[PDB]
Amino acid sequence: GDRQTGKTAVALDTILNQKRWNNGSDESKKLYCVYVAVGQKRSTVAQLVQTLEQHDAMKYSIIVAATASEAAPLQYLAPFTAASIGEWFRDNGKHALIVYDDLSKQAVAYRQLSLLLRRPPGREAYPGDVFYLHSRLLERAAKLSEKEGSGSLTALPVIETQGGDVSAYIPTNVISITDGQIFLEAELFYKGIRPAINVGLSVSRVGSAAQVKALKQVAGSLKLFLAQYREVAAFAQSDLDASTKQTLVRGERLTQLLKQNQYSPLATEEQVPLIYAGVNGHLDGIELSRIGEFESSFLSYLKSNHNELLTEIREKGELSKELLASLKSATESFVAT
């Protein structure tokens, strides 16, 4: 995604959510995060560290630091070294998440090494075997066999798009290796959609295989609705068909809904309700400005009134027709107020 558009911010949001699971005893719920700061100013990382300390995330966080000042050999080995740390957790059968940020600066460091070692540089003046480096690194992220102990080492490489360029040699290689992409978009950022993720250009090759069953149930619709909203997006600029206009109402409210104030993650047991409301289209009846107020209020209404439901959603992790029934009732009741 787009250069320093809170690329680190998008990443940081995940780390905060890992606190919730981390607090829980289960070590499948203890993802021991690693943020790998490559070529990053000590001040910037100090701010990161300070923010992490503020959210008390330091107590499972590891910050592998190869700062801007730290030289290109350290930078070259920085993701690889970090990965090895990850192996220990993984080997113990535990889970962890390593965020390599950003391989774009890793590439440059390798470029510096190679050119200085007089090795012929590859495409776009980035070493020829930079692909080989990336392929080795990115294939170390693995969900191990039950036989050889179930462990994992989730990874989320960060690539900085040089003016949104995704055709560049370092992006193209990485794009092939990766199992999904998330593509941040400048227009969306400007249009105040934070996260500024363009979900059209975001893809997952693992996708629905992992995700809560409950959340899967109430978000098949969401994919389809949003799909129409995107197509009928350009129809937003006169005298418009009723069908398109209905889509626009549902779609616009959804677009506002997926805004989230960055550095605040949400609990899944309350994510499922918000999307459910949208699915039941009761949010169609809620004014755009009032979506935000509605959201927090709806959550509080659920927290007081239907905290049985919240606990049920959480613990069952699945939604029975009876649970969806009760949930709908709650949504209707809140929507009425």
């Binding site: 012929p120 540089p121 495409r123 776009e124 003046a125 055709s167 350009a234 129809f235 600029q237 006169s238 005298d239 418009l240 068909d241």
Partner: protein, 265 residues
């Protein structure tokens, strides 16, 4: 550079394609209303035409024309302009009343003397009886329309849903009503001034119908034009895509060569 200048221009073409698509759809929406109206209006007109036929209508002069202020709705403006000019050969001394900026401009060049009355604030709106009535009222007062024993009006008959033919018709004056022979095969004595009332009445009924026919043809033409545009934009997209792709490769090659040359030394 080349690559980026191609790309920005290609983006323009993309936006153009999208807009011309959008415009075609919005035009379709508007077209539905236009057509709906046109039936009801035409039915009213046909009942009057039944009178004129049975009456045997027996038709300085006026030329009235209808187009919109706005453009980019077919060749409505200039095909009608050419056909007005043809009928301005048919009557050089006629006073042209131009309803629509686009027809106004073109004729204004050919004779500015003939432009006598012109009307603004019609073109962006759908035809309405209120407008027709007022225009008629002004035609009578300002142009003394009855004095000119020939009136002719130009509009666009929406020949097919894919076509528009600029068309004209003659409005039937009080003089026309007077000298209609089988007028007398309708009973009136002198109780009402039926020529002077009916003239006024058919001035508007005919004018509204002409506007409705015209508007439908105009909006349909706009839809058609904007559709063909989208196709043209696609072709240009493809042409710039090949250029973009080739240009991208060439830059890469030229850069590579420079590095290689440096390395070779």
């Amino acid at each position: 550079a080349t690559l980026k200048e191609v790309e920005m221009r290609l983006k323009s073409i993309k936006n153009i394609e999208k807009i011309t698509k959008t415009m075609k759809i919005v035009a379709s929406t508007r077209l539905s209303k236009a057509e709906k109206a046109k039936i009801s209006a035409k039915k009213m007109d046909e009942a009057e035409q039944l009178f004129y036929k049975n009456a045997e209508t027996k038709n300085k002069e006026l030329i009235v024309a209808i187009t919109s202020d706005k453009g980019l709705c077919g060749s409505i403006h200039s095909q009608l302009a050419k056909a007005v000019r043809r009928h301005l050969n048919d009557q050089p001394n006629a006073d042209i009343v131009t309803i629509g900026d686009k027809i106004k401009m073109q004729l204004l060049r050919t004779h500015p003397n003939n432009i006598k009355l012109s009307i603004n604030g019609i073109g962006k709106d759908a035809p309405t009886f209120q407008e027709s009535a007022l225009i008629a009222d002004k035609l009578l007062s300002v142009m003394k329309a009855g004095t000119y024993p020939k009136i002719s009006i130009f509009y666009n008959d929406p020949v097919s849903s894919l076509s528009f033919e600029p068309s004209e018709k003659p409005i039937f004056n009080a003089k026309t009503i007077e000298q209609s022979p089988s007028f007398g095969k309708f009973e009136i004595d002198t109780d009402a001034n039926v020529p002077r009332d009916l003239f006024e009445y058919t001035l508007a009924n005919q004018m509204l119908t002409a506007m409705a026919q015209g508007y439908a043809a105009e909006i349909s033409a706009r839809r058609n034009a904007m559709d063909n545009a989208s196709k043209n934009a696609g072709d240009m997209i493809n042409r710039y895509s090949i250029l973009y792709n080739r240009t991208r490769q060439a830059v890469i090659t030229n850069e590579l060569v420079d590095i290689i040359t440096g390395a070779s030394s």
